[PDB]
Every structure is written in C-alpha cells, then in structure tokens.
Amino acid sequence: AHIEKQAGELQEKLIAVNRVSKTVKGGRIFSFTALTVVGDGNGRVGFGYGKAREVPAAIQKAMEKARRNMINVALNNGTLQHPVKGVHTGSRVFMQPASEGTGIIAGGAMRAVLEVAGVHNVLAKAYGSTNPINVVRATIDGLENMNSPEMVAAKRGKSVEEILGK
Amino acid sequence: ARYFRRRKFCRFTAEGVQEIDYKDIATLKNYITESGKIVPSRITGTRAKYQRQLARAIKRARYLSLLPYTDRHQ
Amino acid sequence: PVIKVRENEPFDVALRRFKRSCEKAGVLAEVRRREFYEKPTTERKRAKASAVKRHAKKLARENARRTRLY
Amino acid sequence: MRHYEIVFMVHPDQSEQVPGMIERYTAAITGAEGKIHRLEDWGRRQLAYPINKLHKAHYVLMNVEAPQEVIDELETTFRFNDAVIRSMVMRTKHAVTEASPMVKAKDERRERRDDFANETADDAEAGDSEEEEEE
Amino acid sequence: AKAPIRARKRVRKQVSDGVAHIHASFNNTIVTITDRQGNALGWATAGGSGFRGSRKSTPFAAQVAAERCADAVKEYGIKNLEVMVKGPGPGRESTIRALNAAGFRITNITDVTPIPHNGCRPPKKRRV
Amino acid sequence: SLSTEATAKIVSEFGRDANDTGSTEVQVALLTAQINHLQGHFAEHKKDHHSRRGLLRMVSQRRKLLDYLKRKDVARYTRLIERLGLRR
RNA sequence: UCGCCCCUGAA
RNA sequence: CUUGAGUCUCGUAGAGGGGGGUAGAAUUCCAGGUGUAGCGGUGAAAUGCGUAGAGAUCUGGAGGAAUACCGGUGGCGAAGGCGGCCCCCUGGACGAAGACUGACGCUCAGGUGCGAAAGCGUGGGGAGCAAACAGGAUUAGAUACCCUGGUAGUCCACGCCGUAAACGAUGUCGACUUGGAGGUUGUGCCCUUGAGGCGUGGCUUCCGGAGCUAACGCGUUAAGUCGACCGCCUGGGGAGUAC
Numbered sequence: 001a002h003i004e005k006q007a008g009e010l011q012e013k014l015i016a017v018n019r020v021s022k023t024v025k026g027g028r029i030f031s032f033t034a035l036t037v038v039g040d041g042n043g044r045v046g047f048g049y050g051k052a053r054e055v056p057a058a059i060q061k062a063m064e065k066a067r068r069n070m071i072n073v074a075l076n077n078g079t080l081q082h083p084v085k086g087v088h089t090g091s092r093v094f095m096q097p098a099s100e101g102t103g104i105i106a107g108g109a110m111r112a113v114l115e116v117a118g119v120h121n122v123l124a125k126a127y128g129s130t131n132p133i134n135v136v137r138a139t140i141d142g143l144e145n146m147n148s149p150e151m152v153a154a155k156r157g158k159s160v161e162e163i164l165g166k
Numbered sequence: 167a168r169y170f171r172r173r174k175f176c177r178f179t180a181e182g183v184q185e186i187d188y189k190d191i192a193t194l195k196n197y198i199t200e201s202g203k204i205v206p207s208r209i210t211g212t213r214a215k216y217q218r219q220l221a222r223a224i225k226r227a228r229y230l231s232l233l234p235y236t237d238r239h240q
Numbered sequence: 241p242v243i244k245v246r247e248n249e250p251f252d253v254a255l256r257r258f259k260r261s262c263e264k265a266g267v268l269a270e271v272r273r274r275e276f277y278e279k280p281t282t283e284r285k286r287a288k289a290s291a292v293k294r295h296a297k298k299l300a301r302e303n304a305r306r307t308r309l310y
Numbered sequence: 311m312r313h314y315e316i317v318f319m320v321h322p323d324q325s326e327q328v329p330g331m332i333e334r335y336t337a338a339i340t341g342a343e344g345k346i347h348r349l350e351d352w353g354r355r356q357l358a359y360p361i362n363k364l365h366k367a368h369y370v371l372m373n374v375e376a377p378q379e380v381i382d383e384l385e386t387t388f389r390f391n392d393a394v395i396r397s398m399v400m401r402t403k404h405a406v407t408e409a410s411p412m413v414k415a416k417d418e419r420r421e422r423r424d425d426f427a428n429e430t431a432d433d434a435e436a437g438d439s440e441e442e443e444e445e
Numbered sequence: 446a447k448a449p450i451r452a453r454k455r456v457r458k459q460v461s462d463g464v465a466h467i468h469a470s471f472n473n474t475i476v477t478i479t480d481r482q483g484n485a486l487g488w489a490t491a492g493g494s495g496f497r498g499s500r501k502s503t504p505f506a507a508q509v510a511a512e513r514c515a516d517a518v519k520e521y522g523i524k525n526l527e528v529m530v531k532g533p534g535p536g537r538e539s540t541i542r543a544l545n546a547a548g549f550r551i552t553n554i555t556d557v558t559p560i561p562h563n564g565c566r567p568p569k570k571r572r573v
Numbered sequence: 574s575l576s577t578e579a580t581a582k583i584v585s586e587f588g589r590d591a592n593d594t595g596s597t598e599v600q601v602a603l604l605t606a607q608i609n610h611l612q613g614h615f616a617e618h619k620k621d622h623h624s625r626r627g628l629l630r631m632v633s634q635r636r637k638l639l640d641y642l643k644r645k646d647v648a649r650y651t652r653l654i655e656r657l658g659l660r661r
Numbered sequence: 662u663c664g665c666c667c668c669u670g671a672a
Numbered sequence: 673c674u675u676g677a678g679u680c681u682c683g684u685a686g687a688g689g690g691g692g693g694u695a696g697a698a699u700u701c702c703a704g705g706u707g708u709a710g711c712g713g714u715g716a717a718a719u720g721c722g723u724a725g726a727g728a729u730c731u732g733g734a735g736g737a738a739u740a741c742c743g744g745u746g747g748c749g750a751a752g753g754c755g756g757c758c759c760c761c762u763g764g765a766c767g768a769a770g771a772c773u774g775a776c777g778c779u780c781a782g783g784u785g786c787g788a789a790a791g792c793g794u795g796g797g798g799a800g801c802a803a804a805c806a807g808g809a810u811u812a813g814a815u816a817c818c819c820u821g822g823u824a825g826u827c828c829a830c831g832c833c834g835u836a837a838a839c840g841a842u843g844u845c846g847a848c849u850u851g852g853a854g855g856u857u858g859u860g861c862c863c864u865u866g867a868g869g870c871g872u873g874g875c876u877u878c879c880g881g882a883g884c885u886a887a888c889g890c891g892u893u894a895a896g897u898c899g900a901c902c903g904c905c906u907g908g909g910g911a912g913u914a915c
Contacts, residue, residue, distance in 0.1 A: 027672090090886045134886095167863070174863090178867035180274060189317075190411030191355065192425070201243045201556065202697095203741040214746060214856065218686090219803045221742065223411075228358075229757050230319065231367065232399065236359035237244045238560050238697060241469075241537050242530040252545045256538065256554060257529075261555065267740070268533040271464045271561065272570045274801085285745050285877095290876050292745095292854065362697070378760075387758075389693075396695070398758060466729065472713065475728060483730035485707040490727080493710060498717095517707090525903080562739040562756080565699040565800040566826090571714090573664075573812090573818050574762065580680075594772035595679030614690090614762060619830080622786060623689035623749065627763040628783075634678080641776035651723075 001070035003065065004044040011039040013116050014059060015047070015109050016133055032058035034063025035109075035136055036066050043073035045143065047136055073143045079121040082147040091126060091134040093141040098123040109135035117143055182216030189227035198224060202234035241268075311377040313347075315406050318388055319361070319395040320368040322354045327393070328370060329433060329442035335384055336374070336440055344376035347407045348418055349437020353426035362395050373407040450519035451487060456484060458521060462552075465526040465544060467511075471534035472499060474507040476514045478523065487517025505535030511543040516561040519548075531558035557569040564566050576605050577626040587656070597642055598653055605657050635659065 005012065017034035032052045037045050046064025052058040062101055075081050080097050087093055091108075100121045104114050109132045110124050125141075126135060176184045182197075197220055198204050204224055207217045228235050241260045315336075320328055336346050352369035361367065367440075381399070388397040406412060418424060419431035430444060436442045462481040477488040491501035517562070526549055527540040530537050543552065580603065585591040586607045587602040611628050615621060641661075643650040 167865095170864070173864055173866080173868070179739075181867050183777090183867095186410060188406060188411040191416055193411050193416065196291065197702055200245055201390050201741090204743095206742080207744070207746095214744080216683095217746090225742085225757060226398070226400075230369070230396065231357040231359055231695085232355065233333070234358040235756095236694055237556065238558060240244060240359065241533075241558070242518050242528070242556045246555065248552060251551060252553065253538065254541075254554070257539075259554070263558070264533065265562065268558070269535075271532045271559075272568055274567050274569055282744090284743085285471055288745060288855095289878085295853075296879075359696070381759080385693085398694085401759080451708090455707095458706085464729080468728075473711085475711095477707090477728050479706080479729050482706090484705065485729060488707070488728065490710080492712090511752060560740050561698045562737045562741090564697080564698085564736085566737085566802085568801065572816070572830070573662095573715090577681085584680080588773095592772095593679095594681085594702080596773050597679095597776075598773095600679050600773075600776095605743095611762080613740085618690050619760080620786090623688040624761095624763045625689085626786075627689090627752075630763095635884095636774095638678080638776065641774090 001046065001068055003067045004040065004046055004070040005067060006040060006044075007036040009040045009042070011070070012118055013037050013039060013040050015110055015112060015136055017055070017058065034058045034062050036062040037113055037116050038063055038066055039118070041116070041118055043075070043118045043143070044070055044137065045113065045117045046072070047139065062121070071139055071144045073146065074116055074148065075118060075146075077121070078119060080119055080142060080146065081149070082118040084142040084145050086138040086141040086145060088140045089134040090128060091131055091137065092128040093138045094125045094127070095104065095138065095142040096125075097122045108132055110138050113138060180211030182212050184189045184216075184219075187219040189223050189230065189232070191227065191232040194220075194224055194227055194233060198227060198233060202228075226236040312375065313402050314372075314374050314376055314381055315373040315383075315400040316374065316384060316397070317399070318370060318397040320370060321393045321395065322364060322366045322368045324393050325354055325368045326445040328368065329444050331435060332372070332437055333374070333440065333442045335387075336437065337378045338383070339374050339380055340419070340440070342377055342380045344374060344380065346438065346440060347373035347375065347405050349373070349434055350412060351430045351433045351437075352415060353430035354410070357427050364395075367395055368443060371412060373405050375405075432443075446488065446494070446505075447568045448489075448513045451513060453487065453517060453520055456520050456522075458482070458484065459523065461522060462525045463518065463523045463527070465528045465540075465549075466549040467508065467530050467532075467537070467540045469502070469530065469532045469534050469536040469540070471502055472555075473501045474510050474536040474540070476507070476511045476540050476543065479519045481527070486521055486523065487514050488498075489513035489517060489551065491564075498532055502534045502536055504535060507539035508543045511540040513549055515547045515549070524549055525553075527553040527555055527556040529555055531556075531566070532538070575603065579606065583612045587653070596640055597645070598649070601635050601642070601653060602657065604631045605659050607631060608635070608659065632659075 001133075013036065015035035015037055019030045020033050021028055021030055029041060031039070032055050033049050034055075035047050035049065037047060039045050046066040046069035048062035048067075048069060049060045049137075050061030050065065052061060055101050078100055079142050082087065098121055102121055104111050104120055104122060104124075106114065106124050106126075108126065113136060114122050114124060116118070124138070169235065177214050197210075204221065207214075212220075234240065242256055243259045243262045247254050247256075249262070258305050320331070332349060336349070340346060343351060350371040350373065354366050355366045356366045358426060383401070385397070387392045400406075415425040416431070416434060419426075419428070422428070424431070433442075433445070458480055460481050461569050462487055464479045464481060464483075466477045466479060468476075470488070470546075475488070476490070477485070479485050491506040491510045494506065495512055496503070496506045500506055526541075526544060528541060528551055530541075541551065556559045583602045583606060584593055584599055587593075588599040593599050596606040608631055610626060611624075615625060615628070639650065640652075642653065
C-alpha cells in the first residue's frame, strides 16, 4: 500500500506484542512478533507482523508492514458513519456509530485501533472467545467496509439517468 | 437426403450391438472367456448398456448347457 | 494359473503366465481370508481414482516437459 | 394373454416323441384362447456339460400366446416328466418368432447349412401347421 | 539334492499317457502322476524329499519332487503329460520344466483347480 | 396392479363425464380399486415391505383428495363415498 | 517379517 | 387461474419387494478303485491325521450352504438394505407428446409402520467357518493374537427385541447461485450418411470458481445464498450410569 506514517501528523501506536515459537531441530526458537498501527487522527491505518530476535526490531518491521497494509477510511464527525456487524475470523465483531458525548468504550484492540482511525466517539462490542489478535480484524469490519452519504446518494442519482436514456 | 431417421452402424471394435440379444450357442461364444467365464467390461471396452444386454443372453444359454460352466471339473 | 486351452507343441518353457492372467488374479488367494463388503469395494474406487487423476496429471506434466532438467 | 416361449430339453433318444408331445400341448393352448405363432427346434446339439448325465441333449422351442392357466399345466408336465430334462420359458417382448438368434439357427437349417440336422428343420414347419407326425 | 528314489512293482498299467497333477501349495508341493485310466502310478512330495518350513513350496523343492515322482512312473513307460496346475503358491512351472527335462513332454495344458462360488466359508488364518 | 381396461371403466363411471382424464372423483376411485385387491396381496404374504409401503401411500393419497372434496362440494363428497367401499 | 513390555517434574 | 401438487396415456431401464421352481462349480460326508510312507501346519515347531492303507488322484452316490467370473464411485430402494438362472404376484423412479384436475400443498411433537448384525422363544436343518472349549505354540506368565481340532451359533420358517461410526458423523421440503471433465439412463434434432455430430431432461462421481468456514475443506447433489416446519445442544469427568 502507501505510507500512513507521515511527518507532522504521524500517530504511532502499538497493539499486540508477545513471543511465538517454532520447535527447531535442536531446541526451540522465539520470534518476537507484535502488531502495530500508525494513524494520523484522520484515518490511514494498517497492521504488520514482524519477526525478530528482539522486541525493538519486532515493532520496527511491524510498522514497515503497517504502511504496506494501509486501508483508507474517510468520515465526518468523530464517529464512523455506518454500522458494520460483519465478522472476520472467529472473533466476532460489532460496531455501531454513536453520538458525540461518549468514549471509545472498549478495553481490547478496538480501543486503540478505534482511536488512530480518526474515531473516538464510536461504540463497539465483541462476542466470542477473548483474543486481542483478531479483534484487530475490525480493520476489515468497519473501517474498510463502510458507507457514506455521497455513496448512497449516487445510487439514487444513477437510476434517474437510465429512465431518461430510454 | 434429410429425414431418413437412423444411422447405418451400431458396430465398433470395442462397442457392442443394440436392440436384440438372445440365446443361441453360436453368437454368444465370441463374447465370453474361453474358460467358461464371462468377459470383464474394462478390457473389451464395452459400455454398460451393451454389457447388460449380453449378460442376460449368455447366462440363460449357459444354463441350457450350450456355453460351458464346467471347466474346473470338465 | 492355467486354463483348459492346451499347448500341444514341443516346449520346455511355454506361455502359461498369461494363462495366469486368464485365471488367477488373487482368486485363489481369497480362500484363506475373510473380508467385509466394505474392504474390496473401496479398493475398486482407487483404480477409478487412478483413471480420473490420469487426465489431471497430463496438464502438470506438460509444464515439466517444456524445460530440460532430466 | 401374453407371449410365452417355452424352451425345454427332451431326452436325445426320445426325440422322435417330440412332434406328438408338442401336439398335445399346442392343441390345448389354441383351445384356451391362445395361438401358435410358430414351432421351432434346435435338435440334438452336443451338451457343454452333463445335465442329468448324457453326451448330448435334445432342444426344442415354442412361440405361443396363451393365458397363464395353461402355462401352469405345461410346467407341471415337465417337472414330473423324466424324459424332459431341464425346462425354461420366456415371455413378452413381442415375439421372438422371427428376427432373433434362435431364428438365425433355424434359417441355416432350411438352406442346408444346418446348425444341427436336416430333420430338425422339418419339425418346425410341421408344428406351425399343427398336423404333426412323429419322426 | 537329497530326494529319495522310488519304484513300482507293476508294468502292466501303462497306456503311454498320464495326468501330471501338480498342487503348488503355499506351504508344500505335491506332484503325482496318475495314469490316463485315472489310477495312480506314482506320487511324491516336497516333505518326503526332505524339505521343511516354507521351503517346501520353493522352486528347488518343487523340482526335486517332480523327479522323485518321475522315478515312480518311469518303469511303466509314460512320456506324455496332461498338466493340471493348481494352488496359488510357487512351483507352478518348476515342476513342468523338470518333467520336460526328465524324458517327458507336455501334450495338454488343462485346468483342474478348485474355484469356489463360496459354498464354504474361508478361515481367518494368520494375523500376527 | 390395475389394467388399462379397468382404468377406462372407472373413468367412465366416476367423474363429471367420461374420458375425464383424471378428475378428483376418478383419482380417488382408481386408488380404491387397487387397494381392495392388494389386501389379498398381503394375505398371501407376511412382510413384503416395499410393496406394503406402496399400498400405504395410495391410502394416504385417497384420503387427501377426499378432504379437498368435502371443501369443494359436500354433495359430491357424500355421493363418491356411497359408491366406494373405503371412506375411513 | 524375526513376538519384544517398562520409564516423576519445572531450561 | 396454473406456475406448485396429482392423475391419465405411451414407452424406458434396474441386484426394488415377496413367493415358488431350476442349473453347475466348490467344500464335506459315505461308498468303490489305484498307489505307499508320509500328510498337514509354521517364522520355526508341535497337537492332530496315516500301513487298521491316509494325503493326492480317479469313479459312483448324498447333503448343506453359497452362487466364481459376471462387476464397475454400475444400478435400484425411504432407510436398513438388495447379486447365478427362470416363472408368478407386486412397488417405486424417469422421459415423451399431449390431456385433465385445479393449491387438492409443505412440514410435523404425539401416534403408526419399516429395523443390518448379534440376541431371545418355538419348530426345522447342519457342509464349511467359528464365540465357548481342549491340546500345542509364542511369551517370564499368554485364560490371546498364532497352529490343530471344535460346540452354541451362523442357515431355513414364524414371532419377538428394536440397537449400529443405523454415516455423507451432513433433518426434511421448497427456492435460488460461476463453470469443466467423466459415468449412467430417457428423448428431440443432424448428408443421422461418423459405433456417432449437435441439443435437452433424470440420476452419479471427480475437479474447482465465487462465497462460506477457525481451518481441513464444502463447493449448483453445498458446509454458498434464502424461507417453512420439526428434532437436538448449552463445560468436561460423574454417566447414557443411578432413580
């Protein structure tokens, strides 16, 4: 994709951070992996999974890859414009728009991912097994998938032209 | 010309004939194994429909002692 | 392993190993073992699994045939 | 009623009895609202294997339409005749009087390219008349 | 090899022909030459040759037995075979070939072999 | 079994006319006729499971049609019953 | 083809 | 009213169901013949069987059970399930022109019927195989796998029990949504001048797109996309046990 870490407006942030393992021929190795997001407070948000032998380069590489998995989002107000109740992976995702005068209200991944993405008055919820790692798939289920007033308005405008043409 | 309404063949070197199969010593003996066994269809190359038709005829004639079925004690 | 058809010519070794293929196929080797209906029928469906896959193999093979690596 | 097609195996040395035997059967069939399409034969062909011993056996065929009532009595005879060896009967499918492999064997005999015997051809013609005489 | 010799007291049962019975068993090999009148002339087997185990069915074991049998029919004067190969084990051309190479020739290849239509039920046998 | 002859008789009797070609009346009629003598086809046998299943379906079907008939014309339904032997 | 079991724990 | 459903007509194919006949092969028993010191089994062995003549081999007779090949993701049935051949009685499916009925339909707790195999009762039958059982072997032990025998049973008739990884681990019905190749079975068309060339239905495998799924994969015969109704689940062990 394209950069989401941009001078004078960058909004670096992290999500997960942990270690994972592979069982090698000898002993067992540890790969320092982590999820990140850089925002701008205006959308443009992504995610990356680094692999490293150290925690700093785990976040380095994950923010490289964050820019390579940027998704665009555009909105008005401090809240998302459309509810998306879609589910990606086995973590169940829900997402309402909500009037200003309320917080993010979420302790999971979607506390921080729903901050960087220019939203902070959104109300969201999740069901199913607790697992922050795929709460992050609310990139798919709300930011990537959306509707906007001028999208729906051009449905109503497309139809009129066809009747005239015949 | 047009509207003559049938084919001139139903014979092939691996696909059988149609519309009549019946008991009679002569005809049947060509389509069975020499040991009084019946042919496999995966060798001969016959399709199901040919095989079913032949089978019926074979077995009837066989148990009228026209085709052998004693070859392990003959 | 033989059939009732005779060989009447001088031989010391004669063809009788494709009279084996006109008799035996494991049909004298099923007389010391019991099986269920399930067992041999599933095996028949591995010899028609061979035949459908035969077509599929040819597409894969064609790419290899282009290049020389043998 | 429907077609029927009694093929049976007589004793090969009681083959001279055959015309008379047939006549007894055929007459009853006709009288029961049947019909004799044609009587056919297949002579004393050499058997593939012994059925009730023997080195050869007589064969004979019948093409008849008859109600089941008579087909009963006919079967009874055979299954209590020791001269009659095996027996079989086929039915329906129009009639196999003409244009079948059984007929093909018969056609060769009349032309004198005989499948089995000169005598066997003559018996078929006799039965169709129903003026049969023993061989 | 180690096979015994055999001989018979009759020389009056000949017809100059005899059935070569062979039973090529997975655990043994029998070779018996019966006359063409259907009455025994000679017989021999692998275990009587002296073989033991599953080396009674082997090619070698079949040959030795075919030749033991040959000694038991030579005195009648027989020189034609009506080979009846049967059983599933080896020794099925071992015997044939040995006979040919022993002053006999083949004349007929016939099949007399048990083929069941399942009028009896098989045993389980080995499972170790 | 029902012969094509026996069919045509039932068609001529039942229905509004003759040569109805399958009308509610004739439909029930045909079924009835079969069932009655297939009682004797299970009086010559014990269990004959597939054929038995067949019989049951015909009984069911006969009743279904009758149910519509009382909701179409009472007079018609009553009349048909009298002429038939099955009505349970 | 030659049967053949048994094995306290955190790096 | 006819698009749903159903009937009528004409054909089509099949191991659909039930009943009764019939053929041969194989094993076995019994009888006779031939021939003699082994047979059989096994990784080796041993028990067992043989001079009172076996094994094998040949001839005659008898009986029980099952039908080699056929035979294939081939076919049929609601499912369970169903294989030599023939007759009788009988069910279901599908297609083709038309013709008719006119929502008569769909599903379903209860209820009712059908149930592989084992089992049980009653009566027939008994070859082979085989729980049990008895020797032998392997093993430290071997109440087993292994070997030699072998009883109940398996088999037939009738009734009963109703279970199964009763499986596609996939409720049933209706409706839709890319396709490709094969299999199978109807039917229309095409110098049918090609066993076939082009269609169009029914059923059946394999592949795979989108989509779905946690993934494996499923994938127009869905685990896709919808509706209708019913059944079930709601942590594991305790327990499909107790009461």
